[PDB]
Design a protein around this ligand. Structure first.
Ligand SMILES: Nc1ncnc2c1ncn2[C@@H]1O[C@H](COP(=O)(O)OP(=O)(O)OP(O)(O)=S)[C@@H](O)[C@H]1O
Ligand SMILES: Nc1ncnc2c1ncn2[C@@H]1O[C@H](COP(=O)(O)OP(=O)(O)OP(O)(O)=S)[C@@H](O)[C@H]1O
Ligand SMILES: Nc1ncnc2c1ncn2[C@@H]1O[C@H](COP(=O)(O)OP(=O)(O)OP(O)(O)=S)[C@@H](O)[C@H]1O
Ligand SMILES: [Mg+2]
Ligand SMILES: [Mg+2]
Ligand SMILES: [Mg+2]
Lengths: 319, 325, 166, 258, 261
DNA sequence: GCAGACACTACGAGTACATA
DNA sequence: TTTTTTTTATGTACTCGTAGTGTCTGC
């Protein structure tokens, strides 16, 4: 036997063990206890617990009938236009003896990967057989799922987990695993997680396996500080036309091994939601795109990124 | 036995003890292997830092030579890795047991940034579903071309650039295993021109040893064609100290004498432009002009006009710096 | 079975008096379906954008005893009651609803052999059997060749004798 | 508990090949009298009424009345591997979601047990089709299948006219016009080829060719077929099997007469 | 100098059409004992071990041992235009790259010499355990091919069990389950159509149907096939050619996880 | 023994999109 | 209160139509 990693070993099996989004998880607990669950589409960031919530709800609704009253499909399966007609519809037509308030559950994990034709064919087989079967879809990008499918389901949206919500589950894992720790170490794990429970468990397991103790320097010897936390500071320095501090942050990101594409992607990501003037934001975005065309065409050096920073600082002083 | 190989492949770190720099990451991976707690890995960093060598040393440590073909599935950008391969050979490899000996299997996906987004979305439940049976290692240079769903599932290690203090003893081992006469300035020039890359430091070492037979500073800077530090200081002094014609004549004589290229001159002058305590308005103009000159050299453009524009970008700011006082 | 069904299926309209659509659209669809009573049920008596619909409702018939628009097209944003209005109006006028949605094969041979089966035959129950009103859901997802098959079966002069709702 | 041991799988094969591309499901009704199947198309064009009595099986066990709604393609996939002359055990429980078929089809003691998942259908009800047909003729199945294939060669629809002399088939097309005249062929040694006429008030209707071909695909099921048609009542073909039961096919005529 | 001589071209055509959609490349290990080929598939799930004897060829000479790795699509295109009753000569030099296939036209008049360029893959030797198996079944190959084709219509992963009674095949799919059990079919006039059970302990293992259907393509090679199964060692499908050699197929079980409930 | 019919997979062709 | 059409140059993925072709039926 091989020991599973703590992401898969400490996956919650009950809906009460899921932290974060307390209203939606509490309503899912009520629906698992009583029954008659509507069609559900859960959207949100990765690592939030959408697949865990869907699987726990399906398991608590069915019980012993899970192998015969559930159809789970992923992006690893085909699920093309010939599978919605011939497998999903045949499972919705299938007779399964179930208790009252319980229905067959068609789990469609990662529904963004489905084509538009498959989602168009899914509409009437979801609407007709709703007396016997139910749908539980999970997704990251809610815009990929079309408007009729979102109208045919209850669109639950998960937000990023707070630091206390991650800290509660991490303390549960620590007390289960007897991991020695300090407060600054768990603060560093929460900082490197960035709303992701998978990354929190992976970083905790990596630090505990590599060093055996959780302090800040043991975490940061293996984990890394996030990129946009410094990209926001360099964009703020470019707003105040301070080229020296912006180049200091740019050279710090360059010596850490980040490619120009990743750096300019984080620069565009920060400048998209930065708090400044709108016309200045549009000029910044146009200069970022002009630099990114040069980055993609082949020329990608520190001089090009420094020239981009100089052009962003020039856009401030030229109204 | 003696083999006709490049020195970047003849001298490869077959074990984890032969890699130099990332000691905390390699210690953590060694403790993952020794405790049989190896997770799905995501190795990212600049090229030449030792990610493929790391995963090949880990695969040779985990599996013996009598079973290496049935436990390791190594796929890279030279192989077809479409969504029919994720649904085909990769899923069948992940979902089946072993043939000879019981154990956990490894699917190495080198150059994971080259995979399509359909394949990366299909890989998610293959990674999550068969965590007990198989383990996945995604290796990339650009982390932005990997979807965040795959970045969440795999714990990531930043294989950053190799520091020149730790790059020296491996180069000394390669030198003592090849009988190369090298001076201290030759090793310093090697670790300066490598810039956190052990491929380019071995290539440059082999090229210099074949071209000249000795590895000094002058031989390395002649074989590579890179300008010396004194040449860049002279070019900056000429561009800041005298008029257009004399500086143009001196830089043209220096370029014709040593056969220098304008790209390396632009890179070293860009490095010098931040060490020099310029005014902030002057530095913005200099960086914008040098970025424009670097962009103009990417096409069929005469290099003499671009050299004149490189002089012009400093002759513009000479009187501004002087009258700033 | 209150805990067995969805609330949309439990509170679905089963009559004309409990619909939630626009009443002008309901009356126009009901009058357009009642215009087929002279050629389907064989009885002379049944019992801006608005101006063109009112003109087409009173424009008369062809010499083949049919309305000049043999196909009704229902369009709008999702979540309004278009399928509900089509089914309620078909069951209200004495028709039997034949559904053809996007979960079918929608190839031109299958499309032809379904439209020709639904529209060109009588009832297997003999006298007193309901006529077939072909409701084609999600016609915008159909390929162009299927629409050409539908237009060819609409313009065969093989005469079309049953109403079609898209 | 429902158990039915069909003595030969040939009749099951010919039935499930006859209604293969005809009906989308099989709704077996199980009582103590036997097995009933009353299926109707969604467009109300064709109807299938199959009855297999309890005396036509090797054994028949039925405690409660059952409704087995099952897929046609999933059963055709089974009895493409069945045997022509072998015993087929069709079994089900009282309250179950599955339907099992046990057979020894290759005659090589190869025990094959194929299970199907039942399909839950809405329980529509059709009580009794009224049978007051004026024109009742009797015809061999092979000649009917051959003449339906001959019109399928030329046309797309058949004008069927009953008469005292015989049943006349007509088909129109661009390649040509297909027309035969049925005569009294009772002066032969074979009694299956004899055409018995019990008609009055002659009727000429129009029918689709594809459903007629799907009806006449059951020629080896019975030696003689019975045709019953009249005004504004759908056409009936009827195959009377030797010991197990009977099979009735109903086809509605087209709106465009002649 | 390596020079083998197939007396007829049909057996090599059947071998290379059995492995065409499965084997990525053919590694002919050449010795004085015969021709060996141990190659995995592209998915690293299956294994093919072909052993052709030196006595089966017309003339067989081998001075030094060779290991010729060659592509399979090229050899498939070469063997497509080969007769079933002609003598086919395989030639290889000591330090050259040209593996030569010399044969005759179907008109049997002109000669044809097709060269192949040998590949230079360094492949580590895969250790066959050659241990005892808990289940050995001798059954006809045509019935095995028929039962694999009939279970391919139901599902995709098949649970094959074997015990003292006999082999049993199950396919829990979307239409339903199909359970076919065969035993003691030796009471016929033929000798090829017989089911014989030799070993004791019952085993139940789940395998993919695509690899089983690829393995059944060697049905004209042998009238009688052998199935070897155990709790640890993989599924072995053994075809015994009449006077040339034998062919072993190894298929690993799938990972099946029970319900928590 | 050989002509006709059945489904089978491999292959050719048309279309869309590719970002946060 | 307002609607037609093919260019961008590869690479991949999906979907659908078509054509040899192995195999089964019958006289
Ligand atoms: N809210 C949570 N509470 C407890 N553990 C969690 C939570 N969210 C994630 N985890 C852990 O992270 C693992 C992955 O959770 P998933 O549900 O697969 O993430 P996800 O929400 O599906 O994100 P994506 O889009 O599928 S990558 C689980 O098995 C848990 O171990
Ligand atoms: N840390 C290291 N220690 C020793 N040799 C190294 C190291 N890093 C790189 N090399 C040399 O560079 C060769 C190739 O390194 P790789 O494993 O390809 O590095 P990499 O960072 O994975 O490269 P990319 O990103 O895939 S181009 C090795 O075989 C060595 O010769
Ligand atoms: N008066 C009503 N009261 C309550 N529910 C209603 C009422 N009218 C319609 N509905 C429900 O609202 C929905 C109406 O949508 P449908 O008519 O089925 O499809 P649609 O309106 O055409 O939208 P799309 O494009 O198909 S998603 C169904 O779920 C009906 O049950
Ligand atoms: Mg998930
Ligand atoms: Mg590499
Ligand atoms: Mg609708």
């Amino acid at each position: 036997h091989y020991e599973l990693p703590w992401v898969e070993k400490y996956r919650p099996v009950k809906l009460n063990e899921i932290v974060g989004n307390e209203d939606t998880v509490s309503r899912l607990e009520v629906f698992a206890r009583e029954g008659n669950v509507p069609n559900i589409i859960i959207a949100g960031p990765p690592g939030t617990g959408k697949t865990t919530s869907i699987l726990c709800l399906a398991r608590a609704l069915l019980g012993p009938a899970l192998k015969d009253a559930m159809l789970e499909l992923n992006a690893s399966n085909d699920r093309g236009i010939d599978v919605v007609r011939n497998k999903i519809k045949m499972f919705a037509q299938q007779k399964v003896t179930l208790p009252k308030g319980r229905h067959k559950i068609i789990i469609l994990d990662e529904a963004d990967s489905m084509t538009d034709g498959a989602q168009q064919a899914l509409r009437r087989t979801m609407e007709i057989y709703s007396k016997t079967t139910r749908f539980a879809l999970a997704c990251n990008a809610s815009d990929k799922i079309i408007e009729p499918i979102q109208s045919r389901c209850a669109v639950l949206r998960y937000t990023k987990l707070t630091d206390a919500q991650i800290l509660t589950r991490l303390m549960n894992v620590i007390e289960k695993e007897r991991v020695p720790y300090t407060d600054d170490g768990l603060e560093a794990i929460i900082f490197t997680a960035q709303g992701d429970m998978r990354q929190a468990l992976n970083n905790l397991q990596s630090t505990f396996s590599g060093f055996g103790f959780i302090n800040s320097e043991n975490v940061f010897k293996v984990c890394d500080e996030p990129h946009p936390l410094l990209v926001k500071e360099m964009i703020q320095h470019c707003v105040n036309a301070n080229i020296d501090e912006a180049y200091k942050i740019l050279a710090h990101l360059w010596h850490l091994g980040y490619s120009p594409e990743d750096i300019i992607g984080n620069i565009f990501r920060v400048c998209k939601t930065f708090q400044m003037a709108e016309y200045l934001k549009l000029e910044f975005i146009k200069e970022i795109g002009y630099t990114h065309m040069k980055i993609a065409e082949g020329v990608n050096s520190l001089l090009q990124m420094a020239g981009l920073l100089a052009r962003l600082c020039q856009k401030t002083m030229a109204p | 036995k003696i083999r006709n190989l490049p020195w970047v492949e003849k001298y490869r770190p077959q074990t984890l003890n032969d890699l130099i720099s990332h000691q905390d990451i390699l210690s953590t991976i060694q403790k993952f292997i020794n405790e049989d707690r190896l997770p799905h890995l995501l190795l990212y960093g600049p090229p030449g830092t030792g990610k493929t060598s790391t995963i090949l040393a880990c695969a040779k440590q985990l599996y013996k030579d009598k079973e290496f073909g049935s436990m390791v599935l190594e796929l890279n950008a030279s192989d077809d890795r479409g969504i029919d391969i994720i649904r085909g050979p990769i899923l069948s490899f992940a979902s089946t047991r072993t043939i000879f000996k019981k154990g956990f299997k490894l699917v190495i996906l080198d150059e994971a940034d080259a995979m399509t987004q359909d394949a990366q979305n299909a890989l998610r439940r293959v990674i999550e579903k068969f965590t007990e049976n198989t383990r996945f290692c995604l290796i990339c240079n650009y982390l932005s071309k990997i979807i965040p769903a795959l970045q969440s599932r795999c714990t990531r290690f930043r294989f950053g650039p190799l520091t020149p203090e730790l790059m020296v003893p491996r180069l000394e081992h390669v030198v003592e295993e090849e009988k190369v006469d090298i001076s201290e300035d030759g090793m310093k020039a090697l670790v300066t021109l490598s810039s956190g890359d052990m491929r380019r430091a071995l290539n440059i070492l082999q090229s210099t040893n074949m071209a000249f037979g000795k590895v000094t500073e002058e031989t390395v800077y002649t074989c590579t064609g890179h300008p010396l530090k004194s040449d860049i200081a002279n070019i900056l002094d000429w561009m800041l100290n005298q008029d257009f014609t004399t500086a143009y004549r001196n830089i043209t004589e220096l370029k014709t004498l040593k056969g220098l290229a304008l790209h390396d001159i632009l890179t070293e002058i860009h490095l010098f432009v931040h060490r020099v305590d310029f005014p902030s308005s002057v530095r913005i103009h200099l960086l914008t002009k040098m970025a424009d000159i670097e962009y103009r050299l990417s096409v069929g453009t005469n290099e003499k006009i671009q050299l004149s524009s490189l002089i012009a970008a400093f002759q513009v700011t000479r009187d501004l710096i002087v009258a700033e006082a | 079975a209150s805990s067995h069904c969805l609330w949309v299926d439990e509170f679905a309209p089963r009559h004309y008096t409990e619909l939630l659509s626009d009443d002008f659209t309901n009356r126009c669809l009901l009058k357009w379906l009642k215009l087929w009573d002279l050629v389907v049920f064989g009885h002379e008596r049944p019992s801006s954008h608005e101006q063109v619909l009112e003109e087409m409702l009173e424009a008369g018939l062809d010499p083949s005893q049919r309305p000049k628009q043999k196909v009704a097209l229902l369009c709008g944003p999702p979540g309004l009651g278009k399928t509900t209005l089509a089914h309620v109006i078909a069951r209200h006028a004495g028709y039997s609803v034949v559904e053809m949605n996007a979960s079918d094969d929608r190839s031109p041979e299958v499309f032809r052999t379904r439209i020709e089966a639904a529209t060109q035959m009588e009832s297997v129950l003999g006298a007193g059997g309901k006529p077939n009103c072909l409701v084609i859901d999600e016609i915008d997802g159909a390929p162009v060749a299927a629409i050409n098959v539908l237009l060819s079966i609409l313009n065969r002069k093989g005469l079309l004798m049953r109403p079609i709702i898209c | 508990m429902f158990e039915a041991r069909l003595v030969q799988g040939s009749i099951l094969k010919k039935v499930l090949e006859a209604l293969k591309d005809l009906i989308n499901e099989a709704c077996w009704d199980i009582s103590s009298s036997g097995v009933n199947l009353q299926s109707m198309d969604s467009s109300h064009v064709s109807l299938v009424q199959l009855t297999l009595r309890s005396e036509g099986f090797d054994t028949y066990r039925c405690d409660r009345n059952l409704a087995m709604g099952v897929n046609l393609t999933s059963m055709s996939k089974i009895l493409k591997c069945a045997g022509n002359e072998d015993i087929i055990t069709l079994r089900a429980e009282d309250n179950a979601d599955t339907l099992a078929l046990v057979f020894e089809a290759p005659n090589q003691e190869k025990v094959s047990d194929y299970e199907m998942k039942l399909m839950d259908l809405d329980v529509e009800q059709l009580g009794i089709p009224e049978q007051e047909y004026s024109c009742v003729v009797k015809m061999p199945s092979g000649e009917f299948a051959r003449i339906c294939r001959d019109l399928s060669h030329i046309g797309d629809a058949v004008v069927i006219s009953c008469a005292k002399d015989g049943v006349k088939f007509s088909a129109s097309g661009e390649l040509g016009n297909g027309n035969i005249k049925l005569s009294q062929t009772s002066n032969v040694d074979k009694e299956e080829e004899a055409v018995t006429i019990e008609m009055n008030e002659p009727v000429q209707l129009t029918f689709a060719l594809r459903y007629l071909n799907f009806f006449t695909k059951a020629t080896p099921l019975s030696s003689t077929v019975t045709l019953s048609m009249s005004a504004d009542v759908p056409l009936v073909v009827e195959y009377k099997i030797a010991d197990m039961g009977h099979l009735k096919y109903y086809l509605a005529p087209k709106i465009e007469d002649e």
